[PDB]
Amino acid sequence: RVLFAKKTKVEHRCTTNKLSEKHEGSFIQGAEKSISLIRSEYGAA
């Protein structure tokens, strides 16, 4: 401002950004096989 007049200017700007990603991995597996031969019928137990 100078004689005679008045000027005023205001400017405001803000930004915000956020990102989140999560991934988890877990797995289990197992196999078991077997064979046999055995030479009364009570032994079949």
């Binding site: 000027k7 005023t8 200017k9 205001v10 400017e11 405001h12 700007r13 803000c14 019928e41 079949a44």
Partner: protein
């Protein structure tokens, strides 16, 4: 964003935008099998 300027007139502006998206998937597939085979004795045989 908001801008306000006064030059013998009053002016005000306000703007707000919000966006949020969530996506999740859960899966599990299992296949298991067990095969067994026996062979009894029955001592008799066919040597006839």
């Amino acid at each position: 964003s908001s801008s306000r300027k006064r030059s013998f007139f009053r002016s005000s502006s306000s703007s707000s935008r919000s966006y949020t998206s969530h996506t999740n998937e859960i899966h599990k597939g299992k296949s298991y099998q067990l095969l067994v085979v026996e062979n009894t004795v029955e001592v008799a045989q066919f040597i006839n």
